[PDB]
Amino acid sequence: MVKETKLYDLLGVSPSANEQELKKGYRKAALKYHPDKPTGDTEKFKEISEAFEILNDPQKREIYDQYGLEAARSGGPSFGP
């Protein structure tokens, strides 16, 4: 298992997702939430963008899976969420 599933949920995938699945889930999520779309939702679009950035990086994904989102963010670049 994983500590938290939110990021996987945001992309519409299992916590055991592979790279192809992460990319497909991100593409689908981005298409829903992009601010220029009728279903746009800026705050959710930020969340999905972070979810893909973390989960598609094998190192950050391991950190997330073992320690959670706040841990994965801690110490990160100041521009990030």
From Swiss-Prot:
Q: Where in the cell is it found?
A: Cytoplasm; Nucleus
The disulfides recorded in the entry are none
The UniProt record lists the J domain at 4-70
What role does this protein play?
Required for nuclear migration during mitosis. It is required for the normal initiation of translation. Might mediate the dissociation of a specific protein complex of the translation machinery. Essential for viability.
Subunit structure as annotated in this protein's UniProt entry: Interacts with polyadenylate-binding protein PAB1.
Q: What else is known?
A: Present with 20300 molecules/cell in log phase SD medium.
Name under which the protein is recorded: Protein SIS1
Please give the organism.
Saccharomyces cerevisiae (strain ATCC 204508 / S288c)
Section of the entire sequence shown: 1 to 81 of 352
